[PDB]
Design a protein around this ligand. Sequence first.
Ligand SMILES: Nc1ccn([C@@H]2O[C@H](COP(=O)(O)OP(=O)(O)OP(=O)(O)O)[C@@H](O)[C@@H]2O)c(=O)n1
Ligand SMILES: [Mg+2]
Lengths: 1004, 418, 218
Amino acid sequence: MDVRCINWFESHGENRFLYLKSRCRNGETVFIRFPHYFYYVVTDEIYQSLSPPPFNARPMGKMRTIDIDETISYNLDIKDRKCSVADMWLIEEPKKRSIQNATMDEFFNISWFYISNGISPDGCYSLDEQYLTKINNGCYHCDDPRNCFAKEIPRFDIPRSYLFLAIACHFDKKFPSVFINPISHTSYCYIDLSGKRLLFTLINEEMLTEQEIQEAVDRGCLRIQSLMEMDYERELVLCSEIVLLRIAKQLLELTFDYVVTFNGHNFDLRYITNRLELLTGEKIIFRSPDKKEAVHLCIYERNQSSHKGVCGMANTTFHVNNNNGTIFFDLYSFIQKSEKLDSYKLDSISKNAFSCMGKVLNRGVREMTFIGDDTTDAKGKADTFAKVLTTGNYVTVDEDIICKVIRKDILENGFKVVLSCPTLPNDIYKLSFGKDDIDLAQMYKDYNLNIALDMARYCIHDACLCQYLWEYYGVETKTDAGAATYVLPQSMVFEYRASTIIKGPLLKLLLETKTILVRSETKQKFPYEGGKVFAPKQKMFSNNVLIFDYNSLYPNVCIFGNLSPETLVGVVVSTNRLEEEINNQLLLQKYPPPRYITVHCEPRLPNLISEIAIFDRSIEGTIPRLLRTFLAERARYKKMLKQATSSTEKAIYDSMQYTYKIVANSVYGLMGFRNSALYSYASAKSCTSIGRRMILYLESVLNGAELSNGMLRFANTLSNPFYMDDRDINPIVKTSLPIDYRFRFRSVYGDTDSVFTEIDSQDVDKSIEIAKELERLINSRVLFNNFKIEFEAVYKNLIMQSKKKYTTMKYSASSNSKSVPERINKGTSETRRDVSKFHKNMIKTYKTRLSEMLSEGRMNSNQVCIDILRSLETDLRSEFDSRSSPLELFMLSRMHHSNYKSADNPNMYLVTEYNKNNPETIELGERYYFAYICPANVPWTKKLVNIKTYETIIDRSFKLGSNQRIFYEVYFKRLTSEIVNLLDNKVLCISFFQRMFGSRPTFY
Amino acid sequence: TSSADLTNLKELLSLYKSLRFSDSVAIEKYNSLVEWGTSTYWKIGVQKVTNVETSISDYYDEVKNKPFNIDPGYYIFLPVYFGSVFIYSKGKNMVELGSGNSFQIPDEIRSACNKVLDSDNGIDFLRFVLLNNRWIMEDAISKYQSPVNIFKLASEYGLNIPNYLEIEIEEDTLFDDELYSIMERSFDDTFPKISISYIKLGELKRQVVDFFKFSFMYIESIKVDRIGDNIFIPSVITKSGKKILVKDVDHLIRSKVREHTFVKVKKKNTFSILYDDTRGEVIKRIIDTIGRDYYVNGKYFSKVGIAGLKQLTNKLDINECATVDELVDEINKSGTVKRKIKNQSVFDLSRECLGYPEADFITLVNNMRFKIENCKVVNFNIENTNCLNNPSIETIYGNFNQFVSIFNTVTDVKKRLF
Amino acid sequence: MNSVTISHAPYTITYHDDWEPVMSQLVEFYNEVASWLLRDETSPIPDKFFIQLKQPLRNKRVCVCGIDPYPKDGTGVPFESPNFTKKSIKEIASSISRLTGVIDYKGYNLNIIDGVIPWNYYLSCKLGETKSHAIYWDKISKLLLQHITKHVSVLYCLGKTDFSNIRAKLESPVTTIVGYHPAARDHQFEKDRSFEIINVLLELDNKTPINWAQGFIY
DNA sequence: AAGGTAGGGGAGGAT
DNA sequence: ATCCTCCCCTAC
Ligand SMILES: Nc1ccn([C@@H]2O[C@H](COP(=O)(O)OP(=O)(O)OP(=O)(O)O)[C@@H](O)[C@@H]2O)c(=O)n1
Ligand SMILES: [Mg+2]
């Protein structure tokens, strides 16, 4: 019986069962019920010494148990690490038991189910029908999965059904309340297994007069009296509010594969559930496949706290309590956890997601025609835009002008759209689907048929936009890949973080290598150091800077050093420089480099002067294999990215390989996390120490290197930086570049992984040829092992402000002088989400002007600082008196949470008082907008005493009164410091602050 | 809501109260308990204080100098001695008052201290006085035991205790110089008696009365002389021939007195002590007076030795021998010497058995290069001579060859001793 | 004793001065839901909803919080049973009797113990049901519990499955204990020692301990 | 159920 | 002045 697995879920009744939802080639849905067991791992001595007999058990083989606790010694009398080998058993218990000596108790029971039965969560098995027992229509019970899922066949595709929904509720002057405010519209996008899409909107007829309803029907609307007259193939249906909700529950109770909403767990489904209960005695009832449970829809809350002590909560999500084998997926929490925005709102997400560049095809008097095709933008951008233009009502031009669509014509390859736009002095414009331009609160005061039909168009768009975002972010591909990578149900892929998702492959490794990890002592954490960060040699370079970055440093450091809790031989410490030397001489003979690596760390205790960790590299440990698994997966998705040609395939595969980078890096992080099963203080700090040494090695050999007439001379001797090695060390290496090349290399910065290597040329084509040559020689002759670097880009017009703040123009390694460089901002106010939109515009203007004057080169006297400072004051004073810039340019966004000491923090106070009075509630993980607002009847203030007293939170209906203005003093002070810190004059800058602000400036 | 959680709270409650005298090994445990208390209940009524000093003054009163009159009551009198004051708490180390630190005391003394505190748990901490490298137990601070039973037990276990007096007083008893003299002569103790303390039956609070005079003296020289095994004490000598008693080196170092100056002295009936109203000078001048080959061993003075095989055998409590190879057989005859020979490295043993200080000796070794062949020191030198300016460091540096000779010898015996 | 006017039954609330600075929101909140809530039969009757508001908060140290009042025979007073014939109070009295030795009694009422304020998180439920009005009291229950929390030092909740996220509902940290409700299987209420834990925590917070035996009436 | 350190810039306070 | 602490957010 060929089936493809769709989902796994657990019941929660008196008995616990695990259900599989899978679909046959022909579309038939089959549910299989499995018994749910508790899993325990015990030794043979324990297995035979249990008074209550076990229900079932199977041998696990002969596993080695290693005590991976860490101790320090002051001499070399190190004893063997306590280890034993014994027969192990895996015990299955229908009911929870407590066994005095049961190990591997940090693993989930669902993980044991998958692994000890050979089941892949997303496999496509050909099930053996002699074990399945029919218990209901299309539902089987399986008492033996080991002999049922034995055979897997190649993957095949299946149909899936979807429901996308949105609602609109009456709004007076407050957030809609289920006790007062009726629902006006409900829209669905109904997709069945056949692929047929039905788009329809329901209109509440009880808000229209008899004449308005009569015209609605005569103008082509259906008017249904009850649920049994509903027709899903009609675009518009009018009915009473009770019918609206009875249709809503008839659809929600269906066994869809996905029911997809945007922030509908807190509002959409919550309103429908509560409003129905108030009006009629009806419930939304879910049933299990075998009809042994029935539960009512009731949205519940799951909180996320921080990992510290007195800390509070820092996020919250809402979940559906269904038991019918349906995934109620909510885009709101998904995007917030996997996206970077100033705010996570449906309009802001679309504004960034669905955009393209279009050309003006034909100008008019009250219309402007745009054309978009593969000839105006990157391949696939015109197609993505054209798809959303089908339902879209407004198109935004250059992120500023919101135009209403007058005509639309979708072309075979692109689109033509006619917008209501004033004449603009250009030909090429950015189009995106962003914020609309309507006031619903007023439309509910003059409510009529034409408004009711106007709203219907917006509601169906919001229901379809969920589908376009669903495909845009490739949710289905990410879900299946995650379920296979971490062996867990598809429904749980996006709920868990590192501490849990690492345990899937970890359990496989422990069982394949036959290892048990145990502890007997108390864990104590100490601080340890981090990566090596260089200070910038200059600020503005005006030269090409080559970036040579280690492919994957820390994961490869842990593999090279075989850094794992069970591989450490020991830590030797000394209190004085007499015994330190004795220990060093003995270590060089007891632990020969060919088998051991010696890592010279910084002491953890202040009374120690030396701390040396010895790792045995002969037998590969558990962490190196865990890292190899995640590194291999990332390489596979990077390879597929190279073959992605559309605009959505590239984004999806780039996201996939990024995720695996973070997971492999989390494997490192969990080693320094005190509450991790993998915690190892010595191993985590040894990884960092080796990392620092590799950065210093690469920087040294490159800094001072000279490319000459047919050969490259490295600055230092190319020796192994850790131990004595048999590789060549001659710093002279033959090159394949023309003998006419005569260059010198320097090093201007570097942080943990990459080295910024400066060359004395400005051409961006010779820089690529030379950099590629360095890449070959460095990987083959400078580096000595599994470490490799990649050439990523040529930075041009690099300007650095501080160690971790710089901007540049990026010419990628795979480009040339005929390509357009990217604009890169790292760490600066241009990318920070807690600055402004006003600051960003001016800092870009003046920073560019400064770069151009210094690049051109004049240095008449002190003109550079004088012209910039005088111009800055003009603009700052002009805005203060003109006050023409809208408030939306001076708003900041900040995340709410309760992670404060002394709970009376101004941030908790501001939000708490907001929540108590404003109908809009800010949740514990929500980002809110705020601004600094002051009375309009006060002068320019030079001496600022209290800032926290001007903060206010901006809601959806926040309009300044005649007695309010923007607190320009705080916005201007921050901008001025950022601009003036760029200058290199010690007299004009200081006098500038004294005149404009009267404050003491800070410089870096 | 479990009994385990109740226990952890009671442990925090007991240790929160038992502060200011149990600071040897307690702060790390206290920090753990309060971090647990807040983690499992979200709030705890403690401030996580980590800078707790040592101070037991809440158990005592101010010093009474005036001739006051307390006529009724049952009193126990103790001849409080002159010296540095230490306390010893339950399962803790010896700690000095005023500045919390750790001290090494003889193992026989610490064992007896544990025996009386294990015999009965009604004692919060013991009180000790130190003078001339002699430990005496004075007055145990308790809730359930009168100042009688600790003296009976301490004597049996082997601790020094004063003779105490008990009397029920009904007749007029005015405190004055006359009564002070009568009382102090009635205890039959030999150690210098600085004051007399009394406790009233039924009250735990201590009171102390001190009758003393002042004397104006002129110091001519300060000498250093031996009391024990390479342990010396200062003796301040005035132009009249009289001596001013000093308990330790710290007193003269902090008082900033110099030879050929006038000082105030606290005069008692049988002795007098220097009254308290720039560090290198006072240390070097006292040493110069008695000889260059002396250093300051923390609390005491110690002379430079002439260390060799004979001294090593005397400190390891084994028979004298002439060849270093004889040590292996003279150490395995008993089972009691091994305790200090096998349990510590060569560096530590050679420091303690030759008379080197702790803080200053590490400072010297951490500024010194060594040439070591086959785990034997053959050469050394100094990287930064600015560490040698301290008189204590120069004295041990100039004789460092003695450390090297023994250091190699101790390595040799371990090679075959194991 | 002041009062406010309510648009629906009981048409008035009488309260102690200590509750005055939350009455403004309580009136607005109740007047939003009373027209829906009062359509059915409730436990207790509407005139008993706001009966614990006639209670000073300045002499309270520990709060004993339930989830809702008895499905039947409610008096408005949490945990109160005029005949001591309800499972919840039986186990509450039994557990403390084991600790104190007081076994000869006719009843046990938490409202007479010094420093104890018993409280029902939800002020009412549907007659014969439990947790049935969670939607009606959501706004009010949050406000009232926070007001008590600002006064007491130790919040004692009954039910680990119901108060697991109580930390999310309070802005003022309180020394929270969550135990078992005195109604579940396996007699898990009487296996806790929360009565002594509370007094130990109070001593750590420099507060007078509670003599829990004061609740016994004979 | 809960990954790690390095570092800049800003607000408020205790001197 | 003048440094210290806390925090928000970013680079790895
Ligand atoms: N969350 C993160 C991030 C980084 N890092 C650390 O920063 C090092 C360099 O960061 P990186 O160069 O951006 O990441 P990478 O491993 O080199 O991957 P690459 O892009 O293929 O070169 C990483 O090796 C460490 O993983 C850490 O700890 N956690
Ligand atoms: Mg890298």
